[model samples]
Each structure stands twice: as structure tokens, then as C-alpha cells.
Target: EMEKEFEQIDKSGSWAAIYQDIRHEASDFPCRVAKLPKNKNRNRYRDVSPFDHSRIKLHQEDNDYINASLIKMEEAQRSYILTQGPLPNTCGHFWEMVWEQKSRGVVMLNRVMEKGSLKCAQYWPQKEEKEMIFEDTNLKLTLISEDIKSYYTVRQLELENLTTQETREILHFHYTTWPDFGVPESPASFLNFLFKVRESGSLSPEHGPVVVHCSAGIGRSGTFCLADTCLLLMDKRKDPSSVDIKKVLLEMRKFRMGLIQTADQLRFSYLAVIEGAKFIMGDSSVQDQWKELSHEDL
Candidate 1:
């Protein structure tokens, strides 16, 4: 069924066309927030918007607005807190949410600066510095260790609740190569990174939802979640043929707006899912296959 759907989509000239159709259909839902002016400006761009139904709401004690949403996958027993990259002012709120939610890990999918564009704030503590404090949220974040990889970086962060004098260890997974509005070079690199996050046990139900963010938290972020969810479903069922990528994506979009943003991203997702399923099915050559296949333009 998955292969047949992929073939049908491949036959259709461009995946962007299908994405546009999906976007049009989703426009009927409410997304604009006339009641909250502060939250609207916190968004990186005017065009990128969040849906009201699935938007994550902060506690009344914290600032009334933060552009984050909670995405729950009941069957998969996974939950993710999806939100935009932190703005200069929202850094405090970002940590507040993480600390409040008891999130075990943060999956950052973009660089702070991308191709001369400021994609995200330097929300984490600097390496040279021992600890950076956020007075607004009354929190202190200390970088305990750092491991820089070929395509990604892993950092162990200790977040301290200044008011309560409580601290918790948080894993920060940063993928550095994914271009803004573009896909990763190959699924192998991405899958490797995905497994790293999984190994941390962050995505499990025992912890709070893993917080995932890109520049806008919909495109690259959505691709990560979709690919991971599809691969896990396949693993659990022991059959790549069981999961419907399109249906899963549609359901996820209901939790957040403009997920899997472009046709290229949507195409890359299918490739990743296919390659991931192969890996799960015990194909040893799948990584090399992904590397070779990703070289071609979709």
C-alpha cells in the first residue's frame, strides 16, 4: 500500500502540487489569533502561523503566550512539544516550558545562523561560559558536556530551578546541516541522528514530550516526527507495508499548521521513511542505499 501510494505520487508531476491542495483544504480551519497580539509577533515570520486547536498554552503564572504546541501519538506512546525557534525575548519562556513540562530532551533541527540569515537565538549556554542564567524565568542553564559529531552535536544541559533550587539534566540534540526550507543530504544521516535521540529514551512516555524545534517548527520538525513515527510503526508491526505515510502526515498536521512545508520536504520524508523501513527490516545495505539515492534531485 505504501509503495502504491508513493508510485501514484511520483507519477503526479510535482509533490508540491499535492501539498498545495492539502494546504487549501486545511485553510478552512481557524489559525489566526486576534485576541493575542504578543504571541503573533513572537513568530519569526508573518506568514508562518500556528493553529488554535493544538497550540500549547502556558500556565497562567507564566507569560500568557508562547508559540508552542503539544503533539501526542497515543498508539505510538510518544508525545512531542513542537514550537518555533526561540526569539531574543522568548528564550526565558522556552526554558520555562521545558522545565515546566519536565522534558527529557530537546531536538533542535536547524542552526542558529543559516546562510547569513538569523534562524534561531542562541538559546543554550555558550561553551566558553560555564553557565548562562535567565533572570526572567528564574532559571540557570549549565552546559555539562558536549560531543560534536559530523552532522550533529549532542550536549548535556543542567537546568536549575532558581526559585526551588531544583535541577534536572536535559539532553540537547542539534542537527547542524539541514538547510532552511530544504531537506537533509540523506536519510542515513538523519536516521542516525534520530536513533541517537531515541537511545536517550527521551521520546518514551516515561518523560515529558520531547521538545522539537526548527526555525518555524513545522517543516524540518514535522519531517523528523513523521519519519520517526512511520519507522516505529513499521518496526512494531514488523512490516513496512502496514503504515500509510500520507495519512499519518495529515493527522499530524491537525496538531500543528503547515507541517512538512514544501514539496521537496514532503518528497524527502517519503525517501527517509522508505529507507528507515528498510533498515528496520534488517537490510544491512540500506544506509549506503540512502546515501546513493539522496544524491539525486527529487
Candidate 2:
């Protein structure tokens, strides 16, 4: 009976939550209030965790402060955005509230580093060596190597360099210093960052497809996939539909291991799409027929 229940947990996708919050005995880290750039609102607790009493209390005591903190973080990391095509070999679970695009193959992407056992080994303080496989097939892949100029940061780039390098093109980017999940600006700005990557010509479809991976290959991968899927759908249908959500997520898991493993994630993805659409559409700043028509005049 216990085994059956556990199976259900895994099947139902409560497994991660049970592991992250209950079984893993993970606790949220401490946060300190920090200042941000000019014209931007004052921010609080630059970092936060659900297990932290102070962060929880901050949210409980004053949601306004939490919101402000999110905005500040968004403004601060706004410049770090990178655009790319659908990531290959990644799970879609972490990015519940975004859009996605279908790809030729699986891709992986990581956004922020998670704490505790839920964390990826690459992000962990302890290093465990593993054999890597690099297959070259006429693709151009650009791997983002941070701090090659200096310093020993916990985050380091580790991937196999193909022995028989092919002429094909693919671009891979690795970023540092991003906002945590549940932060306000985190969602909108991250989507914008992907747009930046696309606009900068860092990602290319002709090069097979871009593969993005950060830590667990959940949060960042899912976000990128979802964003791509949503944009593609919007472009195709002219009206976005919820029907694609389950399909896109299922497709992600079909190529990879696990993805979009929570109901909260499924729910949040819609919000991300709405917010992203608003951000992109609103910023166009064009005079449209809708703008000229006033309700009072009508």
C-alpha cells in the first residue's frame, strides 16, 4: 500500500513538492533587503526561500514590500536577457507559466540555481565527475562561458567538446545572477530576456536548434520552451488556446525525463503568457484604431 501511494505521488507529480518541502527537509535561505537602480522602486530581500521564516514573514507582513522587491530585481537583471530557439533535451516542469515551441529534438536549459538536494549536481558545492558525450552533426553551438577572464565561482561550464567538429550551427548560453522563483519581476523579465536572445541572433533555427540548460534543466528549460510554444501558437492561431499546454508539456517529457510536474506550474504558465503578451504588445507604442476610439464617443 505504501509503495502504491508513493507511485501515485510520482505519477501525480506531487513527488517534487513532497521531496522539496517535506521529505528533503530543505529550508529556505535568509534574505537581506537591498537597493536597486534609479527611478526603480525600493527592493527588499534580494533573495528568498519558502522555508525561511523571515521571507515568509516578510510576505505575510507586507506583500507590498515583496512586490517591490520583485520589481527591483526585474529592473536589475533586465539586461541579462538572451534570445534563442527551442531548447533541446530539457524538461518542462519548472516553467508552468509560460509559452513553448515545438522543436526538432530535446533541449535543456537552467535559469536559477536551486538550493538543497533538489539542486543540480553542477550547482552543488561538491563536485562529482561524470563522462560526457559530444556528437557533432553539422551544427554551430556556442557555449556561454562565464568569468573565463577570472575568479572561481561555484557555477562553471562543463560539457564535452566534439572531437569531429561539424560546420552546423547552434548557440548555447549560460547566465549568472538571476531572480528567484516567486519573485514578481522574475517572470516578465525572463520572457523579455528570451526575446533579447532571439533579437540578438544568438539563437538560430537553421543550426538544428539551440539547447539551453542551467541547473536542473527544469525552470529555465521549461520557461524557454513554454515561451517559444506560446509565441508560435499565438502567431499561428491569432488567438492563444489552452489546449496546447498539455500537449507541449507531454511532448517535452516524451523526449526528456520529467517536465511540468505540478499543478501550480500548469496554472502559473497561463499567467506568464498573459503578462508576456501584455509586455510585448504594450511596448510597441503604436497608434491603433482601438486607441483612437473612445468609449464615451462610441
Candidate 3:
């Protein structure tokens, strides 16, 4: 039923209209803290900011602000600290958040450099046997291990709280295949990557919220969380078709605005959710089903 719904939406060729309608559903709210002159630099995009109520406060700030929000998928028991890519100045704060919140992993959806632009700062150490220190936050990070694959890289990192003398391991999932200029090539590949993150058990409720980000926290970051959360509900309810993707996205936006930026992203989210549902329904062949639907047609 979920697959059929996707088929009908594709056949109708109304992705744009549906996206536009969802855009209209957006309601404005205050981002007073993000708009402060001093706090503005923390945000990657001028227009994108976290709502005050749901925003994560750096416990060790100048009563500080971080351009990140906490998204709680209550029924699914999944949560994410969605934020913009780390700016050079905020990398320390980024690690600080990781330490303070006890986040077990960081899901990076964009590359550091993209389309000749510095989309984000080199937030982590580039090599092993080396360390990156954030003097501002008294935090130190070292790369423990890294496994590179064609589409992604899994890095194990050690973060030490310089003051506490305590350390933790963090999983860094870098999805390298997404194009600098547009949507990912296939939902199957993205879903495979998503499942990779899911299988880690780090996404469970026991850990601190997993951090997920893109150049901006809204578009690609939002897309990843949206699909991840929707599929979670489908699996939990044992009724994949009953879950409403759009409704879920709207609920998530209450935590962070401007999720699933483009109509193309909206459509892709649907495809990933539908494809993921197939896997839940005993279609264990995720790759081939993905190729047949995504590669051959819409």
C-alpha cells in the first residue's frame, strides 16, 4: 500500500504542488536568540535558526547559543540533535555539545568542501596519531579508526573532556555520495546508509541524542531524520501504510524549521520510506528493488 501510494504520486507528476502545499503549512515562530547580533555568526544560514523552546543550550556557554535543536520522535523513541555544519569558531562547541549531551554518533550528510565552497569547517582531526583541541571549550578529539567505503566512511573517534579527564567513543558516519549541488542519486543507497546507522544501536533511547547535520540543518539533515523517523513508526506499528510521512514531517518541524527543503527531497523521502517499508515487509533484497524502481523510472 505504501509503495502504491508512491507510485500514484509519481504517476500524477504532482511533486511540486504537494511540496508547495506543505510549504504553506509552515507557521512562523520566534528565533529571538539566533537573531541576536552576537549569536548570528553561529548559524550557517541567516534565515535558518532553532526555536528557543527546543534549541540545545551549551551548558558551558556564556549562557551560550548553538544553532542546534533537539527533535524527539516520542512514539519511536528516536531523537536527534539537528544543527548546521560546524563553523570554524564553533567546532569546540560542537564537541562540547557531544560531550555534555553524551551523543554516541554524528551523522554528517554533507561533505566539508562542496562545489568550490567551504560548506563546513574540518571539525575533526584529519589523521590518526594526531589530535584536535578546542581551546575555547577545553575539549580534545582524536581519530581512533576509520573505514572507508565507496559511498561513505565510518570513523571511530575519542572525545576527551579536558577538565573532567573523561572520554567517550563517537561514531562519525559521513555519507560521501550526495552530490554537492543536489539530491542523493538513489533512495536505496541512502536507505542502506540509514540502515547502517540504525543497526549500530547508537540510535536507541539510552544514548544522548545523535547529532545530524548538513551545510544547513534544514534540508538534507531534515530529510535524513524524516525518513528515519517515519520508517521507525511504520515498523513499530506494524502498519507501514498507516504512517503519514507529511504529518510526521510537520510534527518534526515543530522542533526545527524548514525540513526537507525541496520538492525533490520530499519525493525522495517518500521513496526511501516506501523502499524501507518493503524491507520491513520481508523484501530483504534492498539493493535490487532500489535499482529497479529508482534507476529505471521515478
Candidate 4:
């Protein structure tokens, strides 16, 4: 009966009925049944980034300041942003600086992997340090020293280390997609990992603000940051407006220099929020208010 209703609603294009049908069926089917297909269409909007390009200048500087047109303090936590060269040798130096600055969190160096680019092992620091300090877990971060302050590595062959538990004023790195041959892990899996980590409550303030980085600290890193912030805002019933996005990206850029460095990366952040919010709200509505609206609205 619910499937029949869905078919009817689909034909009618009445969002209200579709909503009702989803609600009626959700008692049996709670999670999203259909997955979003990989974006394979070669369209115009495929490559859009969030930050203003006119405001961003690509030149190496000892002190790179994030000069975005807008800024907003979405959440309260003492934070600062910094930029550094994407060098393998810079990891130790950046790590020490993050600790010395007393940053609540830290994101590290990022590298964009092209088809011919080198792998993580080629550019990361000493092998002895990585083997001695970090556990080779598939969960991204390398669990280095975890007594008072826990140290972890993000991408392999790079210098970005996570050194805190707090999620404020920290480093955020961005990189391109991984070069996997198979169906790479879904974004939800990544989000699920983040959720588990946050819920695990294994981190501490005296320990840190969490560090996040990908190659270039803009693409993948920006997506991660946007996803995290979007999820948090949705949980709090906050409106995810464009202004909010511009604000977050600006602040993120301040720390990582070119946070969400590409137009496509920025576009993905907005699109991710849209997709994530829709799924969450739709699922929740199906469970909570679907029955009442089904009968009354029709």
C-alpha cells in the first residue's frame, strides 16, 4: 500500500503526498533506501568553490592572511588560523608551533593528488617516526603519543598532525579525491566515523582541539569541515544560509590559508549541506509528523 502510494505521489509530483507516503512507509523502512549516485554528469556546475576568488591571491608569503569579504563567529571557542608551506619536512615544525601557540585544535598540510602525483609514503616525514608514533589504522589519523596530548597523522606522506580533542580554532587541510580503483568509501562512512569519534569522548581539552587536513587543505578538508559544521548546525536547528557558509569558509581560510580553495570545492560544501539536511529532515519527518499530516492534508 505504501509503495502504491509512493508511485501515485511520484506521478502526481505533489510533494505533500510524497512526504506522506514516505512517512507511511518509514515505520518499516527507517533509513534512506536509495543512495545518491556518484555525480558523473559533465555539467557546468560540476566545478564550483565557495570562497571569493577576487579576494584570494595565490602567492607564497611568510604571513598569508585570509582576506575574505565577510566573517562570522558561529560558535564560541578561542581559535586562530595559520598557513604553512606544503613540505614534508614542515610537519614537525608545524606541530611544535601549534602546541606552542596553545591552539585549541590543529589542521595540517594538504596535498592535491593528480594522476601522476606521488603517494603518501613519498612525501611524509621519517618512516621511523611514523612507525614508532602512529598506529596504522584505516581511520585516517595516526595515534602517535596519547598520554596528555595525543598526536595523530592525517594523510600519509604529509606533515599535518592532529594534536587535540577540542574542535575549535584549529588547522584544516584539503586535498583532491583519493586514487582508489574501486568504489571508494561513501561520504556517510566518513561522517559516521566522525560521529563515533565525537561520541566516544576519548579526547580532552587539556589535550586539544582536533586537527584536520588534506592535501592543499581546501577540497577534501573543506568538505569535511563543512560537513561537520552543517551536521552540528542541523542538530541545533540552525538555518544553513549562504551567509553562514561564507562565514565558515572565511574563518577556515584564515587558518589554512586557502580553505575550500577551489570554486568546485565551495559548491560541494553547499550541495553537501543541502543533501545532508534534506535526508535528516526528511527521515525525521517521516517518523514524527508523517501520520498526522497524511490524513489531514490530503
Best by TM-score: 3
Clashes of 1: 0
lDDT of 2 at 180: 27
TM-score for each model: 0.90, 0.41, 0.94, 0.43
How well is each residue in 1-298 modelled by candidate 2, as lDDT tens digits? 2234435665786745643432133222333332223202322112211112221012122221221111001111111111111122111111100111211122324333444423322221122243223231111223233221111111232232244442222233333333223222344444544554555453444332343443433444545555555654554445544325444544443323223334344445545555455444454432232233211122
Report the number of the highest-lDDT candidate. 3
| Weakest 10 consecutive residues of candidate 3 by summed lDDT | 289-298
Candidate 3 local distance difference test against the native: 0.86
Give the per-residue Cα lDDT of candidate 4 at 169.
30
84-181, model 4: which lDDT tens digit per residue? 22334333334444444343344432333445763222223233255322222111123233211111223222223344433223323222223212
lDDT of 2 at 173: 35
Candidate 4 off by > 4 Å: 1-86, 101-114, 118-186, 200-207, 237-243, 254-257, 275-298
Better lDDT candidate (1, 2): 1
Q: Let me know the TM-score candidate 1 reaches against the reference structure.
A: 0.90
Cα lDDT, all candidates: 0.82, 0.33, 0.86, 0.36
Off by over 4 Å in 3: 285-298
